[PDB]
Amino acid sequence: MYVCLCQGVTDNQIRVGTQCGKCASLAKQVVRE
Amino acid sequence: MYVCLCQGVTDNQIRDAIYEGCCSYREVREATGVGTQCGKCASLAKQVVRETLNDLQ
Amino acid sequence: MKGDKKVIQHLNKILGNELIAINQYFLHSRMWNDWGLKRLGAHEYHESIDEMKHADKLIERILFLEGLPNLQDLGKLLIGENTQEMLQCDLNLELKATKDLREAIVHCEQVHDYVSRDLLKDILESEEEHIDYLETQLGLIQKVGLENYLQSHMHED
Amino acid sequence: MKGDKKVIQHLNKILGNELIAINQYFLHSRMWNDWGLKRLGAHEYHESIDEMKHADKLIERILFLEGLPNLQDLGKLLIGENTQEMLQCDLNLELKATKDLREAIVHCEQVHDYVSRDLLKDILESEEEHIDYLETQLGLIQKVGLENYLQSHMHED
Amino acid sequence: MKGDKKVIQHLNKILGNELIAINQYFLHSRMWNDWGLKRLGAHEYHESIDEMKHADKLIERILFLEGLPNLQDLGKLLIGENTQEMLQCDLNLELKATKDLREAIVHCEQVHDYVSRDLLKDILESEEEHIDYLETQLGLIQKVGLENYLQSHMHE
Amino acid sequence: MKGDKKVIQHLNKILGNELIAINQYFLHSRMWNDWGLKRLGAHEYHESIDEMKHADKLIERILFLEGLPNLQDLGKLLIGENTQEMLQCDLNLELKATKDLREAIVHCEQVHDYVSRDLLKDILESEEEHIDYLETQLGLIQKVGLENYLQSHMHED
Amino acid sequence: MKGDKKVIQHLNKILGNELIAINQYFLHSRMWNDWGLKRLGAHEYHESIDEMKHADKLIERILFLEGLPNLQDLGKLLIGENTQEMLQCDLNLELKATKDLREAIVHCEQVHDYVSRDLLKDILESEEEHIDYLETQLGLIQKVGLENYLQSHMHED
Amino acid sequence: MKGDKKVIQHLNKILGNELIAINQYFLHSRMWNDWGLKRLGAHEYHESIDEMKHADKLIERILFLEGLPNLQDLGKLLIGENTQEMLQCDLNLELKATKDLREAIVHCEQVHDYVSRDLLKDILESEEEHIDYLETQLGLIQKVGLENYLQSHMHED
Ligand code: HEM
Ligand code: HEM
Ligand code: HEM
Ligand code: FES
Ligand code: FES
Ligand SMILES: [K+]
Ligand code: NA
């Protein structure tokens, strides 16, 4: 799914947060895994 | 009331069978057919028999 | 399984009561028609139908909660031999039904199943209206006398 | 008492069969709806209603003959777990029902209860039409494949 | 100020949840339409509309209780990338929504705000029907296969 | 007697409140009409009618529960002398009414009279809508000024 | 103040009687419905409504004359325990009401308030029609017997 | 993706502006309704609905161009505390919106995305109509006075 809608970053693209920042916690988590 | 719907036996018909000489539920059952099909009425029929025999004293 | 196990047991218990009432009212209805008391027969037919609709809603709710609706267990019918006994039999059944509904609602509230509570409260309201009708009929037998009461129920509305 | 006792036993046996079918079909209908197979759910709902109507006619005939309709004894419901097994359960039930109907008819003929025979024959025609439906659905599962068969029953007519 | 402060906080939280759902369902609807799955698109559009109507009732109730409706804070949308994931995303959202509704109702009951309770109960009934719908679709994908399921949602 | 005695006392208390409101609103309506403020008069007339309907439902429920509805004890009417004071009198009355409704509901819940609770909740929703109307009118007097507010209520909708 | 003070007192006295009758008839109506005597319940409901309309006209006339309509004082209701007593209670109330109306009319004529007289005469005509109905019902109980009389009032028209 | 990257950013910027307007107008509408200024409430509700329809068209266009519509980023709502402030808040918002629309149109023209330009021009015409409405209301407040202006917006139609 989209982790960041502002930048269109999916969880698979991580495997961002620069615009509104509401997704930061989630992206930081996907990373810490 | 009908006590046994399968065999169409009322509480008065259970009393009658006793008055006519039945001495136990098993005897009432042989006389009337009560509780010989689905069996769901058996405990209620037994209660009527019990109350009737007790009142006959 | 999303449903509370005791909620599902309560709903199945209410379902079992509805299933008894369906058959008892249907048979009472057809007995009254056989005797030519068509107004009682028609009223009692509609009571049976209303119980069928409650059972449907119960079955639907049990399935949503992922339980198994129990249509297999059919408890004892209370079938009367004359009009006064039949009405009283329906009333005896309904007093048991409302006691079970109140207990089911208590448990729904406790586990926060507010939608199941709301369904049961709706059924309870309908069963209380049936109790009202039954007590009224039994009272009318006393006020107008049994022969008049039966006369007034020969012809349909 | 105008009714032949064994005729009444036979009518009560058919009635007992209809009561099982009512409940079995109603539960299957509501299971298909819960799964989103609404076309199957609707069809099965109408099968249940049709058995209710047959039951009503049996109950009325039994009372006319001065017997007591048996709405107390409920036999074994054959509930399936998936679409194919549910259809087969309905078919197994119907095959037992039609066997009983034929025996009932033989006996009615023997004691000259030609009106009860005609009632039972009408019921039998309806049950055979149900068997035709059931065999057709099972055949279609084989012809179009299960996944297509189910797809085709998602949306109501 | 007639309203209980914690009731108003609960109503604002439920409103927050509805505002997320409005946007998530509307976007999912338009994605399904873009892909030519128009029956899913139309269904999802109506889910979005229904959340809008719930939001309206919450706003009206908050104002009556002399609270301040919060339409400013928008939480995280769960947007899927394909049909199966979009449905599961809607379901995850709904499971959270109903948990919060139950907690709000408990509180309304405690402070005797029975009318707020009934409003929330009606919302909860609607959200439970949406859960029913979502689980049904996820189950159909299993029963009829993904290709058939999508095919069945091309046309309205 | 199926009814809980304190439930019946609570229902009779709410009924007593509705009886005050019926009369207070009816008199205010007819005073607004006498003054030529026909829009206020019509609105207040409908508020009085609505309380009559609530009273009827309470009376019916009390009788079902085998209590005696109290139509004898009429509490204090809060009559105003001018438009603003009349609105405030209606508001003071409603604030007392809603407090009683909430206490009644608590007790119904405690003794599991879920149908009486639902009745009272419906009444409460209506009374809160009245409070919303009253607070709005008092706010409008401040926003548009009294003379404009009154002007706007001379002619009926 | 344009109105004669004693005229206003008389109108308030008639109003007070109407207010008693509203509540007495409304309660009798709902009692009859509770007992299943729906034709009596419906007739008595309409009697209550008719008293409400008289009260309205009285309140309007008192306001025009610049007096204060009194809705606060509610005298004693006469509530019966069975159908015959309830009818007699209504009749007792109506005989008092018509005596007061005649005295009010006398005073209106004396002070030349011919419009108030005309209003009271219209009310008097309606109350006399109610007296006719009541005496008729009590007479029918004697002619057809109480059980038949009640039977004839079970079902609505 | 078929769409120009800066066109999609512009469209997402316009979408972002519409999303603020939708919520800002919807809240203003319900505040006006709460205060009993129903005509303002109804008009503002329709302004909110019109912004929703613009948002829908932008979302559709962004998806056709293979971009990702941004419904996650919600900018600052300008909420006023009285009628004059709310209208000025809406106007402040619209002035910013039209500035962004013009910049977006300039860019679509430069990259020959004439269909996106036409969509934006249509939104722009709508937003300029809203500016006209807002400037007119602010001017009416000055011309007829605040109390009359609000009075004129109490009743719908
Ligand atoms: C002795 C058992 C039953 C009998 C004799 C019976 C009979 C009937 C009859 C005669 C009708 C009217 C059909 C028509 O002409 O449209 C009916 C309707 C219906 N039945 Fe039954 N029924 C029985 C049990 C049940 C049960 C156990 C259920 C559900 C679990 C059920 C569900 C329904 C429903 C939902 C309707 C439609 C009612 C409406 O919406 O008007 N029935 N039944
Ligand atoms: C126990 C007290 C009362 C009860 C329970 C009661 C009940 C009712 C009901 C149920 C209605 C019919 C409403 C509808 O469905 O349209 C009604 C109508 C009405 N009521 Fe009352 N009411 C009461 C007292 C009063 C009083 C004291 C007045 C005037 C002083 C009044 C004035 C009216 C009027 C004018 C109507 C309309 C009748 C018509 O034109 O059809 N009511 N009432
Ligand atoms: C992404 C944000 C939104 C979009 C895209 C959107 C879109 C729409 C659309 C297309 C309609 C149908 C208009 C018509 O054809 O007449 C509509 C109706 C409506 N909207 Fe929105 N909307 C949004 C946000 C909201 C919010 C946040 C609320 C309330 C808090 C709201 C309240 C309503 C209401 C009450 C309706 C009418 C529903 C009915 O038919 O009863 N909308 N919206
Ligand atoms: S969602 Fe990642 S920055 Fe807005
Ligand atoms: S009810 Fe007696 S055996 Fe079935
Ligand atoms: K007679
Ligand atoms: Na017969």
Ligand code: NA
């Ligand atoms: Na496309």
Ligand code: NA
């Ligand atoms: Na489901």
Ligand code: NA
């Ligand atoms: Na005047």
Ligand code: NA
């Ligand atoms: Na308000």
Ligand code: NA
């Ligand atoms: Na009663």
